[PDB]
DNA sequence: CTTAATTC
DNA sequence: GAATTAAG
DNA sequence: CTTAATTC
DNA sequence: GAATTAAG
Ligand SMILES: c1cc(Nc2ccc(NC3=NCCN3)cc2)ccc1NC1=NCCN1
């Protein structure tokens with residue numbers, strides 16, 4: 076049973092993740108950037124009640140923390156919280172787009188490797204810590220009418236909605252899986268941010284490779300979705316494609 | 324007095340023109356063209372009364388004649404008659420656009436020739452006969468409530484609104500003024516359909532050249548506007564430009 | 572909700 | 580220039 | 588007036 | 596997709 080032998084690797088049984096080998100991320104700003112404070116547009120009670128449980132969970136997990144920041148961006152009034160970070164994105168220095176587009180990424184999958192395992196990492200961005208000096212950039216307001224917290228909250232992990240999160244996560248995971256690639260020269264490993272494809276020449280190589288990948292991911296602090304996992308199959312769904320016997 | 328010595332050349336004193344040296348024009352149709360009969364949109368009495376005098380004059384001049392044709396195009400309901408020949412234009416074979424654009428035409432005016440005469444020919448298109456086989460193409464309806472003519476009328480001369488009239492006229496006049504150019508090698512003659520510019524090196528050459536041009540135009544059957552004529556000047560208006568001492 | 576594209 | 584649409 | 592472009 | 600505009 077894949078789930079039982081790798082408890083630490085699955086999001087269902089290993090608790091929230093944290094990439095312990097990765098230094099907290101520093102987010103450089105453009106040379107002329109100055110903090111921007113966008114007022115929170117009034118949010119209906121319906122929306123606040125819908126969002127509330129999620130904010131509480133994130134606070135309990137330490138992913139969100141109180142703060143006082145010169146920066147402030149809106150949470151969408153219309154549940155799961157979505158922060159409009161466009162004004163912060165505009166002020167952050169650009170980085171080279173290193174994530175390959177799916178078409179090019181899949182071009183590196185040879186017909187020799189037809190046994191596949193597809194894993195997707197749960198709450199991947201939240202596994203990467205944000206350095207305290209960069210945390211203020213992502214603050215937003217949170218008020219609980221019937222006695223709430225300070226005023227603002229911010230993320231201690233790489234947040235959703237930030238323009239560089241996909242690239243920074245893809246780069247971080249590449250650094251953490253570099254050794255795995257070296258130890259398994261005969262396996263193909265495709266990475267598209269939080270979506271992983273492991274390809275082997277035989278069902279055996281795939282089983283052994285998948286065990287090694289799960290163990291490595293778990294030890295590194297990442298968590299894969301056991302519910303969505305596709306293990307050692309000859310046909311899998313990956314990045315919108317149906318991979319079947321070398322096709323696509 | 325320029326007007327008195329060349330009575331035949333001016334529209335004011337020579338009567339309507341007729342290019343006697345030019346054979347009646349035959350207008351070739353496209354290979355798949357079939358006659359089109361567009362019904363005349365009702366015309367208000369105000370419009371008909373405004374147009375009436377012009378139709379009568381043209382009939383008296385023989386430029387318009389009664390006819391029965393499979394072709395019919397509209398006269399605009401909203402004075403001076405304007406015929407919508409777009410559907411006829413679409414069915415007429417295209418010819419090469421040989422009239423030079425004003426910019427290029429003026430590029431052939433050297434600074435050596437700074438004495439100018441500008442003439443514009445009155446009702447130029449009407450000076451060119453249309454062959455009877457092509458006359459039917461341009462028919463339109465004309466009804467006079469208080470007892471009128473047959474039903475349709477058509478042109479016996481090159482009409483306004485026809486896509487090839489400017490080009491055909493420019494080509495016809497070029498053929499008629501070819502000899503003049505040969506007899507006056509030291510004069511510059513620019514032709515833009517009905518707008519003519521004669522340039523000479525001295526006021527004398529311009530006077531003599533202008534006399535010769537007027538006499539030639541008159542004999543050929545063309546008529547120039549005495550009212551608008553600009554004779555032997557060092558500054559003239561031509562094709563939207565102010566020609567002054569070699570400039571423009 | 573707000574901001575910018577793409578359509579109509 | 581307003582209706583749809585896409586995306587933070 | 589009808590037909591097709593260019594703007595908004 | 597409607598308002599302006601251009602042209603027969
Ligand atoms: C994709 C599809 C559409 N589709 C659309 C369909 C019908 C109408 N109909 C209409 N307009 C006026 C009257 N009636 C207008 C738009 C628009 C933008 C994006 N792409 C995109 N948006 C933001 C970023 N990228």
Ligand SMILES: c1cc(Nc2ccc(NC3=NCCN3)cc2)ccc1NC1=NCCN1
Pocket residue numbers: 592593594595597598599600601
């Ligand atoms: C030249 C100029 C314009 N000018 C124009 C100005 C203001 C509006 N304003 C508006 N539209 C919608 C609401 N308000 C629309 C059009 C249009 C076509 C041509 N050119 C041309 N026509 C036929 C052939 N060539």
